[PDB]
């Protein structure tokens, strides 16, 4: 037993990331077969990050200035093309090391591992969540640009994320690998505003229900309540309208553990109205939204 | 900026982990040159982990009782020993993924990443600290006994843990690669008592720095306080006497922020007595002891 926030094993991306220099500037890319993705504000220079012709910087590039190098590897590049907001460099040499992989969009509330990378070499690794706002909060220093993020069914890794800016606000914002932005962000140095983010309420459930699996029980009640009216509470606390879908899929969650849905629908409208007095659910004494029913499911069989 | 509770990057380790099977019962087994480390209470039955009498138990067992599998392939087994509590299986072949590593034990206080695995297979990854008291806070089923505990330097992995049990408590306890128990613990399935946890006072003192650094100032005071007068408090609130060590080796983070150690020392006091009252540092409603003032410097360095 026990319960962590958990990222994928990262091997198979480590074996991905390369480094990409355009001039002066360098970030991270990902080499798949022989194309390397990264971002296009890697061709801007520091004052062109505030009003970028993205297609007339591009066109005073070829080939042979983006200086791709895999560890000391250096990548020869035969093709270059701009997809939404990265750079497709198409290189001589598929990765050896491609592991099967596929790109996806993921849906706000969905989460995933991210491998923090500088200079084309990885940092670290942690998990992490799309929020409502499509923002995400994670470690992102200057470099860290085209870091990407990912989850492992399988033997497949789902590529779902690339990381481009840090907000003003200090979170996080990104494209998938396609280069279209999570949320309603552009790539310009220029102030933009992530909305209200919200609580996602079906993770927060599914928490609950790892905390009861692992002994924290002190939160169960002798109530019950209603969607409609768990929702009427949701909205004040700026939690996420929870809707049959996801008491669906709690489904199995609440099968192991004998409970309803509904019944720890009103423990958590108990704890929404009344805090958490100082006490502390599986360690946190916060209640925590970026664990998935499937996280939830991965990590207490295995 | 951000900053987030990041593991080091897996794959190293994953090229590693092997599967290893006596009679009934199936582990995970670390494979370094051409030995494969794993607990020693892989010889034992279901029953027999109630006394077990290892030697007695090693004696009745042969080369070829040992099922080593790396993914698929077999692994011939040319010699067993056991060292204190892990058993070392001589194999023909040496790994030919062995990165460069070292065997370390590691201090109460320090932190190091976890790659949990399940028969040979890497389940996922995650930091986390050897408390005080010698115990750890994991995520550990069934199955994941002989999971690793490492650190990386430079281009070396210095593996520091192996998982053996599951207390009654629900915390975990293991051995360094040498076999000897981290604690008083030993390898039988009797209960057995973890001292008081206490928390890693210089820890949180980093991670206080830390969230300076990353915009939380909300607890810097105007106030300061004295070593001694500041472990009065500490010894009040079971928190682990501060000394002049840790006071150099906050000295980086001290220089970088231009905040004197004993200020921030009185600004935790102040934490310490008067609560949080509601407000969050870094996201957590808790005081955070699982960062050191090293990983502090390098999640804010790159
Ligand atoms: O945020 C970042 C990157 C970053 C930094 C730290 C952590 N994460 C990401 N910016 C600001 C920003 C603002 C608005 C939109 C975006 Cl796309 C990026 C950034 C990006 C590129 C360059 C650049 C330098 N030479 N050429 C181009 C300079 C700044
Ligand atoms: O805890 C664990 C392992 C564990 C479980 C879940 C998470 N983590 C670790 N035990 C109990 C235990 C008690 C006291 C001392 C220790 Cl060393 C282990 C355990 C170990 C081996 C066997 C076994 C089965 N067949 N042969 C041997 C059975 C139980």
């Not at 077969?33 to 990264?38: A, H, K």
């Not at 750079?87 to 598929?94: E, G, I, M, P, R």
């Not at 969905?110 to 070499?121: E, K, M």
Request: hydrophobic share 35%.
């Amino acid at each position: 037993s026990g319960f962590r926030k958990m990222a994928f094993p990262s091997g198979k991306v480590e074996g991905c990331m390369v480094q990409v220099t355009c001039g002066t500037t360098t970030l991270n890319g990902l080499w798949l077969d022989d194309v390397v993705y990264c971002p296009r504000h890697v061709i801007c220079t520091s004052e062109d990050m505030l009003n970028p012709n993205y297609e007339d910087l591009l066109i005073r590039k070829s080939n042979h200035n983006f200086l791709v190098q895999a560890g000391n590897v250096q990548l020869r590049v035969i093709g270059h093309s701009m997809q939404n907001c990265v750079l497709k460099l198409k290189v001589d040499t598929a990765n050896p090391k491609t592991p099967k992989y596929k790109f996806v969009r993921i849906q706000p509330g969905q989460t995933f591992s991210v491998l923090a990378c500088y200079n084309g070499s990885p940092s670290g690794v942690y998990q992490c969540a799309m929020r409502p706002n499509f923002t995400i909060k994670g470690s992102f220093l200057n470099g860290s640009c085209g870091s990407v993020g990912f989850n492992i069914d399988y033997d497949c890794v789902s590529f779902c994320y690339m990381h481009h800016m840090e907000l003003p606000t200090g979170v996080h914002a990104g494209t998938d690998l396609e280069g279209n932005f999570y949320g309603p962000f552009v790539d310009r140095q220029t102030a933009q505003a992530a909305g209200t983010d919200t609580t996602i309420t079906v993770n927060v459930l599914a928490w609950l229900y790892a905390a009861v699996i692992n002994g924290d029980r002190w939160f169960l009640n002798r109530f019950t309540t209603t969607l409609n009216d768990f929702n009427l509470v949701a909205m004040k606390y700026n939690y996420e309208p929870l809707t049959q879908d996801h008491v669906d899929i709690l489904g199995p969650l609440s099968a192991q553990t004998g409970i309803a849905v509904l019944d720890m629908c009103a423990s958590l409208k108990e704890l929404l109205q009344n805090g958490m007095n100082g006490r502390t659910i599986l360690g946190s004494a916060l209640l925590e939204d970026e664990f998935t029913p499937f996280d939830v499911v991965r990590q207490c069989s295995g």
